[PDB]
Amino acid sequence: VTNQLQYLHKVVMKALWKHQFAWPFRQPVDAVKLGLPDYHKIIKQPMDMGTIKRRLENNYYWAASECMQDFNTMFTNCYIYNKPTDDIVLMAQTLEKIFLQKVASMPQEEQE
Amino acid sequence: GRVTNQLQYLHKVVMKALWKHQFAWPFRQPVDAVKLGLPDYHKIIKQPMDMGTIKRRLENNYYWAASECMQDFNTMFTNCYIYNKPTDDIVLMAQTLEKIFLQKVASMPQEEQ
Ligand SMILES: Cn1cc(-c2nc[nH]c2-c2ccc(F)cc2)ccc1=O
Ligand SMILES: Cn1cc(-c2nc[nH]c2-c2ccc(F)cc2)ccc1=O
Numbered sequence: 001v002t003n004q005l006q007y008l009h010k011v012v013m014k015a016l017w018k019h020q021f022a023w024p025f026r027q028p029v030d031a032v033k034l035g036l037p038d039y040h041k042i043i044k045q046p047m048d049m050g051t052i053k054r055r056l057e058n059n060y061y062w063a064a065s066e067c068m069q070d071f072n073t074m075f076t077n078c079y080i081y082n083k084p085t086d087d088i089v090l091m092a093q094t095l096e097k098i099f100l101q102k103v104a105s106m107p108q109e110e111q112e
Numbered sequence: 113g114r115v116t117n118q119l120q121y122l123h124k125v126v127m128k129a130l131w132k133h134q135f136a137w138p139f140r141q142p143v144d145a146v147k148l149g150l151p152d153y154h155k156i157i158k159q160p161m162d163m164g165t166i167k168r169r170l171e172n173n174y175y176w177a178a179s180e181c182m183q184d185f186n187t188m189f190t191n192c193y194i195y196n197k198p199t200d201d202i203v204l205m206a207q208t209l210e211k212i213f214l215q216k217v218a219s220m221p222q223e224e225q
Pocket of ligand 1 (some may be wrong): 002023024025029034077078079088
């Protein structure tokens with residue numbers, strides 16, 4: 001536990017998890033379900049909110065940067081695999097905007 | 113706009129680190145679609161951004177809050193991931209720079225002066 005990680009839990013993940021655009025990011029990408037046979041060839045480190053939430057709830061993370069990199073990885077995976085025109089990219093952009101808005105107000109020192 | 117402690121940190125800590133980086137050179141000026149032979153660039157990327165634009169903007173007091181400057185950084189990176197092929201070195205260069213940006217943004221002063 002740190003102030004910064006409780007911030008990313010109680011402010012960042014609270015806001016994003018309940019967002020009307022969050023639903024595609026709440027669980028891992030299912031290439032079989034979604035019909036994306038190339039997905040795991042293109043994307044090597046899958047990431048999703050569900051995994052990050054669990055990790056925040058089990059104190060998996062040692063630094064706030066570590067949690068922030070997972071959010072980044074989740075958004076980057078989306079922009080890299082998906083066509084520029086796809087709605088999912090707009091939904092990713094909107095979520096990442098809130099992530100960054102909130103991270104700009106995150107506590108400055110990681111005090112344990 | 114106005115000057116705060118956060119926008120000083122973004123200018124004098126974050127932007128300094130990224131700018132000198134060995135992978136930073138493709139990001140220091142706008143993408144020249146004509147010069148680089150990328151005729152579809154402006155048809156795909158509708159809001160171009162580069163650290164050169166962000167730097168001038170921090171130097172001419174364009175930004176009102178740190179969050180506005182951080183959104184410009186995000187657009188710069190996101191444009192790279194959206195336009196380029198996944199296997200392209202540029203995408204690896206952006207990811208690396210983006211990781212350093214998020215590490216440094218984490219250590220930014222909490223409240224905005
Ligand atoms: C992160 N992420 C999620 C999904 C996803 N998750 C649930 N539904 C979808 C989805 C289904 C059909 C469609 F046309 C677009 C998206 C797809 C790609 C991706 O990169
Ligand atoms: C942001 N950004 C920058 C450039 C860029 N800027 C200077 N040189 C290049 C470049 C040239 C040739 C090449 F094979 C790869 C990159 C290209 C794409 C892009 O999205």
